């Protein structure tokens, strides 16, 4: 009854891609899934939240901005502007990916957009 | 003679993946390739360096740490630890990629390694 409760809660969380919330983590957290604070700490940090911390004094941005590779590929693809909108060279995709790293997950600012546009063009012409 | 000098310098830089150093950029920079300062500003920022700035007072880390997707895939692959060391699921690769974004280009710290290890295991088991 206690084991199944933890497994059930854990199963719900894993279905959501909340990978830290194992049945053991849920048990240590007092048979509850993570609070908003614990989720946000994990999201921003990708470290396992302490089952003891509520993280209600953890300072963070509401809008989170972290990109997957799928997202980076779509961004790279629309900047590159190849006919039939086919996939850009890997060298250009790497440059787009590095911009996401520089920006702690955010897409290109206006100055970086220019640099990427120039890079696309030099790789085509 | 001046055009060819700029084209020649520019050709050298592009061969190196220094994409901003076009013949026009080299001309605006007084027929010289970028200084160490301009290169480092571009590397850390991926914005076109001002041909007017020497960036000798630009504060930066010697060791730069930015990862390409190839690098992220190798890291993801050794953490995941699949038999025959085949490619990990895209969902796991995205998590590794997000760690690189959180860390402004650096690989996983010890706490993030644990989180990724757990994630790998939950995705296998
Ligand atoms: Au929040
Ligand atoms: Au041109
Ligand atoms: Au330097
Ligand atoms: Au950062
Ligand atoms: Au297990």
From Swiss-Prot, chains A, B:
It comes from the Viruses. It is found in: Virion; Host cytoplasm. Homodimer. Interacts (via C-terminus) with VP1 in the cytoplasm. Interacts with VP2. This is Capsid protein VP3. The lineage of its organism: Viruses, Riboviria, Orthornavirae, Birnaviridae, Avibirnavirus.
């Amino acid at each position: 009854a206690q084991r199944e409760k933890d497994t059930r809660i854990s199963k719900k969380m894993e279905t959501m891609g909340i990978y830290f919330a194992t049945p053991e983590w849920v048990a240590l957290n007092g048979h509850r899934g993570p609070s908003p604070g614990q989720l946000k700490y994990w999201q921003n940090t990708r470290e396992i939240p302490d089952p003891n911390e509520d993280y209600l004094d953890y300072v963070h941005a509401e809008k989170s901005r972290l990109a997957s590779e799928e997202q980076i590929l779509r961004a790279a693809t629309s900047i590159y502007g190849a006919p039939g909108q086919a996939e850009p060279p890997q060298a250009f995709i790497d440059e787009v990916a590095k911009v996401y790293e520089i920006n702690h997950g955010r897409g290109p600012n206006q100055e970086q957009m220019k640099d990427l546009l120039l890079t696309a063009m030099e790789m085509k012409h």
